[PDB]
Amino acid sequence: LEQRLAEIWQQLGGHSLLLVQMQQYIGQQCGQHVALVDLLRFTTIKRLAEFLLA
Amino acid sequence: FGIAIIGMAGRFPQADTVQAFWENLLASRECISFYSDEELLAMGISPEFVQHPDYVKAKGEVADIDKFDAAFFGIAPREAELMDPQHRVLLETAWAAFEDAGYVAADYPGDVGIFAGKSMDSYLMLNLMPHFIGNDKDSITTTIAYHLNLRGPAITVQTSSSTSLVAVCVACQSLLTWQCDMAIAGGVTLGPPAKTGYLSQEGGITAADGHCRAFSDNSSGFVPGTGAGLVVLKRVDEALRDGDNIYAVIKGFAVNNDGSEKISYTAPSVDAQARAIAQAQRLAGLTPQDITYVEAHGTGTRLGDPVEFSALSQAFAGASQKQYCALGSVKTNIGHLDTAAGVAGLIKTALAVQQGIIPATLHFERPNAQIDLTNSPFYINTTCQPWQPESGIRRAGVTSLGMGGTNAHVVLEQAPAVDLQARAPVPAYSILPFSAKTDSALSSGLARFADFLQHESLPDRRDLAWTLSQGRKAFAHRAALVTRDLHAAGTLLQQAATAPFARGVAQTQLGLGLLFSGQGSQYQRMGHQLYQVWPAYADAFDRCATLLEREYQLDIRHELFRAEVSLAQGERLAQTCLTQPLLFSVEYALAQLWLSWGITPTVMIGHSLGEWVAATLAGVFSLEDALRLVARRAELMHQAPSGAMLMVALPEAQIRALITAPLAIAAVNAPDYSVIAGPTSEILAVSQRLTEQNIINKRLHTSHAFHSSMMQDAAQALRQAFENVRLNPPTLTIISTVTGAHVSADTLTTPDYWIEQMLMPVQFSAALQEAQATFDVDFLEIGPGATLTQLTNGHALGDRLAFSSLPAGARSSDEHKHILDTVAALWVRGHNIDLSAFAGEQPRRVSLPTYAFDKIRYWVDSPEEQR
Amino acid sequence: FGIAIIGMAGRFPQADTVQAFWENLLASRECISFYSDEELLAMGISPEFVQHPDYVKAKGEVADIDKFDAAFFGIAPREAELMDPQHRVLLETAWAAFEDAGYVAADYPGDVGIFAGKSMDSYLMLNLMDKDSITTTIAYHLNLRGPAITVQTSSSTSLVAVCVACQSLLTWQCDMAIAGGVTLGPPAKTGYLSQEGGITAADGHCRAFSDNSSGFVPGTGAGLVVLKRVDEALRDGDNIYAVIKGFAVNNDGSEKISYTAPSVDAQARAIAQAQRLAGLTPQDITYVEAHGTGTRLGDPVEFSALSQAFAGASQKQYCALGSVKTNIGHLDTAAGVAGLIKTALAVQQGIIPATLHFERPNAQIDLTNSPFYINTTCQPWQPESGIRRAGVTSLGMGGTNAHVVLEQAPAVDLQARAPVPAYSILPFSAKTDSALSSGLARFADFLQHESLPDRRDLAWTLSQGRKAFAHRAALVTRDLHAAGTLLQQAATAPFARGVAQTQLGLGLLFSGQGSQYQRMGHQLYQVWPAYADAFDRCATLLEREYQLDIRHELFRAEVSLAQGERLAQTCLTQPLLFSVEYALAQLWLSWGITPTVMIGHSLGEWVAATLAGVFSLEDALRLVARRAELMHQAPSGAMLMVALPEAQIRALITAPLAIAAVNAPDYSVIAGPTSEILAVSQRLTEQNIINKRLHTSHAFHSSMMQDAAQALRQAFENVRLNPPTLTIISTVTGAHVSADTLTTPDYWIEQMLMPVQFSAALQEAQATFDVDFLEIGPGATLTQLTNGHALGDRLAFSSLPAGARSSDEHKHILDTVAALWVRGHNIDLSAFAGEQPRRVSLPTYAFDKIRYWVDSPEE
């Protein structure tokens, strides 16, 4: 999911409305829809992708 | 182990006690007050904020922010206009918190400590522009600690929005490591704009409709509110051997922080709120199947709400049961308080633990999109609802979070059950004392038990009137009440000073004076009620009876107590053979009783029989020798022949001049009153011819004519009886009767004084313009009637009175109300009665109405908005 | 019980450390500045006050208040202008209090609590024309996960915060706390307007406990300490300044004439309780700090409280006295933690400092009957018993009295430690180039003292305490005094200096056969244990299954020139050098090295094969000796290195001789028979080639050993080989390995005859990787060959010195470690310090100064 989410943020300070977009994007490509509370971690995409992968 | 929460106090929005808070949660009322368009453009707010689409003009507000009663504490009215309005209200709340526990701060044996927290100083735009250095967030608690004599630690903890529940979590460690012995720990939030709105934002934290819905899918934000509130804490092994009221027993606490394991500076965390909760519940000793009521923060924001629910479901992970634990919020009812909002939930949970009823959460229809109630162990009420768990013991938990992060979780077990039937029963009557430093704060404190006592919510009379006597301080303007049932007293206290109970200012009065009574005023059921109630009267009465059983044959406690009521029993004791020693024993037993309640006598007069016991209260001779003299004297003076009596209403010189016969003067009492005596025919001769004069002449109804001219032989015989015994110099300032003046060392030591006592006329009037001249004293009778106290206030005793001790014959069953009315009428004047011996067997305290302060405006009038 | 004090920092008037504030207390200096009428008038102070009949112009002053380092912590240059200067200074002082204990805040095993005060917000007067959030910013920027309370007490805040932190740590709320206070004001250029009967002195000096007392003088400051249980302190091995043994707080509520007048009984309950808690009697206390504010009412009451609380002693005039407010001045939220720093130093050293401004005692004070006296010269301190105790008192406006009994740190037995390692790496590291160029010099000025801290305890505070950052540098020293003059010059550096990169992989060259020496690998065998455990088994096998024995010819053979060329024979050189290369590459794996590619050069395949997993140890070792024996029985040979490329060397090769090795595009080796090789060389005399013989009696990689590998063809014992694991690049083909090209018995037989074309292997590795190279072999021959290439800004490092430097192995391997570490690799420097190291106070990070300030209409 690492290079995938790398290119996803190639498509950062955390705004409180981008959470809806990043919640919506997960639902089709990987069909996971991870909880929004679990999407509320840090302001990163690559390092947050690393940590929330493993 | 535990830390009890003994008393509470507050001043919330649209409720000004903690029994108007608990009658606005139970009725499920919305306490938020909406405004108009005219209530803002007259309170000096700008015309650009108003008339704005999203300018929500709601706030949950308190009424009187500018009402201090300065003179109660000693503050001049220029150090009252130079105080932050959050200092005055925390003073008037820190007084009522110590009065809702039945304690006084100033005279507790241990130490007392205050750990509170101030809000943002908003008086730096109200007082700074006109004048002002010396009132910042640092000296709230020393001002609370100086005016009430608090001699423990005095700190100001200052976390951001959980100040009020970090203060409790410091004061629960200060007690548990013995820094102090009783604490007090709260917060405050009050500001000059009590009438203001808020420009709400689409995407912010402020609710754009006015209402604060918590855990609902229509959540918009919160709404700002103001308040106050303080509690009182004490160790749970020192709140069980003293008998206080315990609301709840705090069993665990923890305080933490986040620290850069989140998004931003202001963004919540989950991994720290799941550690505060699961350290509180593991320090307490519990397990998450037991916490039945959890008080979430529940502020009503967008992201602040699924984070908190996730944190709760993470920490309740061990419980394998479905939908068994409540969840709620306060901030739907009263809005969001800012700094005092950790303790306004601690009050609600610590009351709902004690009563056993979970109040209702307003504004709740459907859960949020990111929450599943049905697959989690929580549920949300909407109607008020009873509470009883499966295990039988109710437990709880309150949580508050701060801006930086504090996660203050506390755990509140139910107070243990008590044993209220092992107490010995209530006493027959009790005194209810009410004292207040000014008159207008006494009338409004009397019209405040009017509404308390006429409910069906009312405590015992033994646990009340030990909170009103031992649990407050006795100020000047005091009034008291002796009652049997409380509803009638509630009716009596509301009739607004057209009522029969004691009243009046109390000054110093260092010393009380004693009037001792004479013959002829006794009755049948006399001295019976006090014998089987009080121990000192019964003990000191018993010694006088047992000695005279030992050395004579008259049985006492037979004719007064156990003998049958008849006509012949009335005149059996009215004979002179029995009337002397019974009356002496009664007056000595009553004197012994009145000393133990805290009376120091100064002057001790007599009237024809009070010399024989006013002497022995000065210790001039022993009690045994006193009884051996009095019984001998009464037997020796009984065998004299027939005599008579008369009362004449003419002065002493006129009777000593205008008499017809050589008749001896028996007694001089008042300057309208004297008694003449003589033989059984000459008195009848002068009485009938004086009736023709139409000057009044009753009799005294005695077979022997005392103080006449035929008692030399018996007097010399008892002088021969005198010289076996020995005497002593006196102690107290007796004045005499036949001499008309004071008493020296050898005045009572001479055996001839008791000889001339029976022959010379006793002159009561000359002993009573001299006593009130050399002393300035009130007079308390010790005697079986009310004759002397009717005579004594008939003189020129200016602004002094006289009181009795026993009922006047006809009210012979009021010997337990009449003395207890004398006590409550002496205590109003200022005397040193301790009203704690009239309490009961073993009392506890109860929450009673506090002091009723005055209300004076002290403001700079905000010149900025005045222009 | 107890609470140790294990580190501290601060910023006082006319100082910037604690280490340079003790030097002003021992020298007995007055730090109150004295301004002028022209140093003050242009700074905005109104002219109705300078022209006053009485406006005393004297004030303590901290140096710089408007100097933040916004980019260290991440704070933007707009969020920085809107901080009170008491946040921007308590943020940097809290960092330098944690670098001073020897720790790093954000990585402690337990959790860390903050408890700090503040003062009145005077910069928010500039923001117009909040005290809750001082100790949350300091606990979020530094990742502190314990309690975070802003304990504030009227003029006693500093000491009360220490008495709340010691309340938390003793009942296990947190595990290592921090507890201070801060008081500074935006202008810092004011007088103070003394008035008659007022509490401020009208000449300019505090005069504590003296006849000419008239007031105090205001000040500014900062300063924090760091606490811990005496249990973990004596186990982690920190530096203990003092052991706080008792504490007490109360108040004199209502027992005061007015609000502000002091009392005598509540300053005696505190002093009796603070010593009844710590198990002491008045006689055991020797130094006693006082508040000593030098005011008319406050001085006889302080001496009265002290005499009444100390009245149980049977001696006269033994306990000392003093007050720090003569040197610096009085200011709230300070002088209690500042007067705790001064007493905490003086307990550790043994020196009671001076007391300024004292000739005659006060009228209402009689010292001679009481156990107190007052110094004026900086006397030494030795009690009549062995142990030195103390006491610090600060009193608040409301009357919050705090007494902290200090005890002496328990002594340690440092003689039982094993001696210091022979060398040590000193690493420094900083976020910006300037913050390394300026923090390099403070370790020169620290190191130009005498009686310096131990060299073992100076690597395990710099690799264990100073946080690792981007820009680095590293030295390999053995005497600290030489390191002082080394660090004194910056750009003339003989030490490894550079920026850091990712570097999560390393590539491993291996060496040839003709560059060894004697006494080789002797320093590493005794100092490090992994080399002694990997030299074993390799040597053990050859002293259990053959006649010979490996360890005699290196560490126990007599040094001579006869045995200098005994190992030049092929028979006992191959297993010797294979054993050395395997032992060295085993040691390099215990310092945390992740190898990616493992190329060889004519023997390095045979050991990279072992370390990959294709060969077992005994399988690989059993037959290298047999290969050497079969290879030594060849008749004759010689080599000749011609500096011509492979496109041109084929124009003079005859039938028997051929290419022996191809290493570089300006390098080739030719092997063959000695008469024919000498004929080729005499042909090459006039071709202007600098031309050499490689000193070898055989002709490897040529057509003369078709017979040597035949005993290998039959003696392979059909041994169980294994597919490879690590990404070996071969040198006989010129590309990667396949999973089945390496485990066929034909491959090693073909490998013995076919030449080596190492250069194309390096071009392949540089093409498919961007990797720094580490040679593993006894010499420096395959490093300049690798650096003579197109390696754009990548280098290759050796592992042993250039042949004849056989006493410099143990400095050259530690000079390769300190050159790999600078570029970013994950060498751990914790394994190079000694046995049982402790921590030591050192100069901290050097935050640079850039100014953010909001302008007044006046300033």
PDB file of C-alpha atoms in Angstrom, chain B residues 111 118 133 136-139 142-143 145-146 149-160 163 166 170 173-174 177-179 253-265 275 279 403-406, chain C residues 111 118 120 130-133 135-137 139-140 143-155 157 160 164 167-168 171 173 247-251 253-259 269 273 332 397-398 400:
ATOM      1  CA  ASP B 111      -5.583  21.617  59.054  1.00  0.00           C
ATOM      2  CA  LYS B 118      -9.426  30.854  38.379  1.00  0.00           C
ATOM      3  CA  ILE B 133      -1.363  44.760  39.514  1.00  0.00           C
ATOM      4  CA  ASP B 136      -4.305  38.009  38.907  1.00  0.00           C
ATOM      5  CA  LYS B 137      -4.844  34.223  38.764  1.00  0.00           C
ATOM      6  CA  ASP B 138      -2.342  33.676  41.566  1.00  0.00           C
ATOM      7  CA  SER B 139      -4.212  35.057  44.604  1.00  0.00           C
ATOM      8  CA  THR B 142      -5.124  32.995  49.425  1.00  0.00           C
ATOM      9  CA  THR B 143      -8.059  35.412  49.597  1.00  0.00           C
ATOM     10  CA  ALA B 145      -7.820  31.159  52.694  1.00  0.00           C
ATOM     11  CA  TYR B 146      -7.323  34.349  54.726  1.00  0.00           C
ATOM     12  CA  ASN B 149      -8.654  31.030  58.590  1.00  0.00           C
ATOM     13  CA  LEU B 150      -7.384  28.162  56.433  1.00  0.00           C
ATOM     14  CA  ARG B 151      -4.043  26.873  57.735  1.00  0.00           C
ATOM     15  CA  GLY B 152      -3.114  24.113  55.302  1.00  0.00           C
ATOM     16  CA  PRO B 153      -1.644  24.254  51.809  1.00  0.00           C
ATOM     17  CA  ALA B 154      -3.109  26.812  49.471  1.00  0.00           C
ATOM     18  CA  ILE B 155      -2.270  26.231  45.800  1.00  0.00           C
ATOM     19  CA  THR B 156      -3.817  27.332  42.474  1.00  0.00           C
ATOM     20  CA  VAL B 157      -3.720  24.492  39.971  1.00  0.00           C
ATOM     21  CA  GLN B 158      -4.329  25.806  36.498  1.00  0.00           C
ATOM     22  CA  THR B 159      -4.825  23.232  33.739  1.00  0.00           C
ATOM     23  CA  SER B 160      -6.817  24.444  30.771  1.00  0.00           C
ATOM     24  CA  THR B 163      -8.865  22.627  36.186  1.00  0.00           C
ATOM     25  CA  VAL B 166      -7.288  18.195  38.332  1.00  0.00           C
ATOM     26  CA  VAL B 170      -4.340  16.949  43.714  1.00  0.00           C
ATOM     27  CA  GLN B 173      -3.316  13.039  47.145  1.00  0.00           C
ATOM     28  CA  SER B 174      -2.610  15.781  49.648  1.00  0.00           C
ATOM     29  CA  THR B 177      -0.263  11.525  52.170  1.00  0.00           C
ATOM     30  CA  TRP B 178      -1.417  13.516  55.261  1.00  0.00           C
ATOM     31  CA  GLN B 179      -0.530  17.057  54.161  1.00  0.00           C
ATOM     32  CA  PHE B 253      -8.060   8.816  40.005  1.00  0.00           C
ATOM     33  CA  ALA B 254      -5.430   9.424  37.330  1.00  0.00           C
ATOM     34  CA  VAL B 255      -4.056  12.379  35.369  1.00  0.00           C
ATOM     35  CA  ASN B 256      -2.004  12.142  32.148  1.00  0.00           C
ATOM     36  CA  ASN B 257      -1.160  14.018  28.933  1.00  0.00           C
ATOM     37  CA  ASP B 258      -0.869  13.322  25.189  1.00  0.00           C
ATOM     38  CA  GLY B 259       2.428  14.750  24.013  1.00  0.00           C
ATOM     39  CA  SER B 260       2.789  14.899  20.204  1.00  0.00           C
ATOM     40  CA  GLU B 261       1.165  11.509  19.530  1.00  0.00           C
ATOM     41  CA  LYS B 262      -1.665  13.282  17.729  1.00  0.00           C
ATOM     42  CA  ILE B 263      -2.253  15.503  14.698  1.00  0.00           C
ATOM     43  CA  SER B 264      -1.846  19.045  15.962  1.00  0.00           C
ATOM     44  CA  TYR B 265      -1.804  21.199  19.074  1.00  0.00           C
ATOM     45  CA  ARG B 275      -4.900   4.914  29.652  1.00  0.00           C
ATOM     46  CA  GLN B 279      -5.595   3.342  35.319  1.00  0.00           C
ATOM     47  CA  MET B 403      -6.917  21.617  25.710  1.00  0.00           C
ATOM     48  CA  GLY B 404      -3.311  20.333  26.033  1.00  0.00           C
ATOM     49  CA  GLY B 405      -4.596  17.049  27.507  1.00  0.00           C
ATOM     50  CA  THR B 406      -5.213  15.942  31.120  1.00  0.00           C
TER      51      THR B 406
ATOM     52  CA  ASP C 111       6.940   8.785  31.561  1.00  0.00           C
ATOM     53  CA  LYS C 118       4.918  31.622  35.645  1.00  0.00           C
ATOM     54  CA  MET C 120       2.408  38.238  35.291  1.00  0.00           C
ATOM     55  CA  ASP C 130      -2.761  32.889  29.443  1.00  0.00           C
ATOM     56  CA  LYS C 131      -1.159  31.000  32.316  1.00  0.00           C
ATOM     57  CA  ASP C 132      -2.916  27.683  31.694  1.00  0.00           C
ATOM     58  CA  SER C 133      -0.746  26.739  28.726  1.00  0.00           C
ATOM     59  CA  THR C 135       3.393  23.590  30.915  1.00  0.00           C
ATOM     60  CA  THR C 136       1.470  21.963  28.108  1.00  0.00           C
ATOM     61  CA  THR C 137       3.508  23.552  25.305  1.00  0.00           C
ATOM     62  CA  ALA C 139       5.184  18.890  27.352  1.00  0.00           C
ATOM     63  CA  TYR C 140       3.947  18.666  23.761  1.00  0.00           C
ATOM     64  CA  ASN C 143       6.753  14.603  24.207  1.00  0.00           C
ATOM     65  CA  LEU C 144       6.152  14.436  27.961  1.00  0.00           C
ATOM     66  CA  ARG C 145       3.439  11.928  28.926  1.00  0.00           C
ATOM     67  CA  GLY C 146       2.848  12.461  32.622  1.00  0.00           C
ATOM     68  CA  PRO C 147       0.925  15.044  34.627  1.00  0.00           C
ATOM     69  CA  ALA C 148       1.106  18.595  33.363  1.00  0.00           C
ATOM     70  CA  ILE C 149      -0.051  21.024  36.061  1.00  0.00           C
ATOM     71  CA  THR C 150       0.580  24.771  36.386  1.00  0.00           C
ATOM     72  CA  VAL C 151       1.082  24.944  40.148  1.00  0.00           C
ATOM     73  CA  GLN C 152       1.115  28.670  41.001  1.00  0.00           C
ATOM     74  CA  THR C 153       1.491  30.135  44.542  1.00  0.00           C
ATOM     75  CA  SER C 154       1.783  33.831  45.582  1.00  0.00           C
ATOM     76  CA  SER C 155       5.593  34.609  45.511  1.00  0.00           C
ATOM     77  CA  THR C 157       5.535  29.264  43.056  1.00  0.00           C
ATOM     78  CA  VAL C 160       5.946  24.859  45.777  1.00  0.00           C
ATOM     79  CA  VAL C 164       4.409  19.015  44.336  1.00  0.00           C
ATOM     80  CA  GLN C 167       4.687  14.561  46.081  1.00  0.00           C
ATOM     81  CA  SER C 168       4.025  12.922  42.706  1.00  0.00           C
ATOM     82  CA  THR C 171       3.514   7.874  45.232  1.00  0.00           C
ATOM     83  CA  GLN C 173       2.317   9.164  39.625  1.00  0.00           C
ATOM     84  CA  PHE C 247       9.382  19.177  52.498  1.00  0.00           C
ATOM     85  CA  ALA C 248       6.398  21.033  53.962  1.00  0.00           C
ATOM     86  CA  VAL C 249       3.917  23.698  52.822  1.00  0.00           C
ATOM     87  CA  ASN C 250       1.314  25.590  54.846  1.00  0.00           C
ATOM     88  CA  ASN C 251      -0.094  29.132  55.289  1.00  0.00           C
ATOM     89  CA  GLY C 253      -4.270  32.529  57.041  1.00  0.00           C
ATOM     90  CA  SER C 254      -5.884  35.125  59.419  1.00  0.00           C
ATOM     91  CA  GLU C 255      -2.951  35.060  61.935  1.00  0.00           C
ATOM     92  CA  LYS C 256      -1.575  38.189  60.157  1.00  0.00           C
ATOM     93  CA  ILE C 257      -2.299  41.825  61.261  1.00  0.00           C
ATOM     94  CA  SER C 258      -3.307  42.814  57.714  1.00  0.00           C
ATOM     95  CA  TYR C 259      -3.163  40.910  54.426  1.00  0.00           C
ATOM     96  CA  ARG C 269       5.548  24.827  61.859  1.00  0.00           C
ATOM     97  CA  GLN C 273       7.738  19.578  60.068  1.00  0.00           C
ATOM     98  CA  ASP C 332       8.589  36.104  42.339  1.00  0.00           C
ATOM     99  CA  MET C 397       2.879  37.162  49.690  1.00  0.00           C
ATOM    100  CA  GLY C 398      -0.199  35.319  51.068  1.00  0.00           C
ATOM    101  CA  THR C 400       2.932  30.203  51.738  1.00  0.00           C
TER     102      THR C 400
END
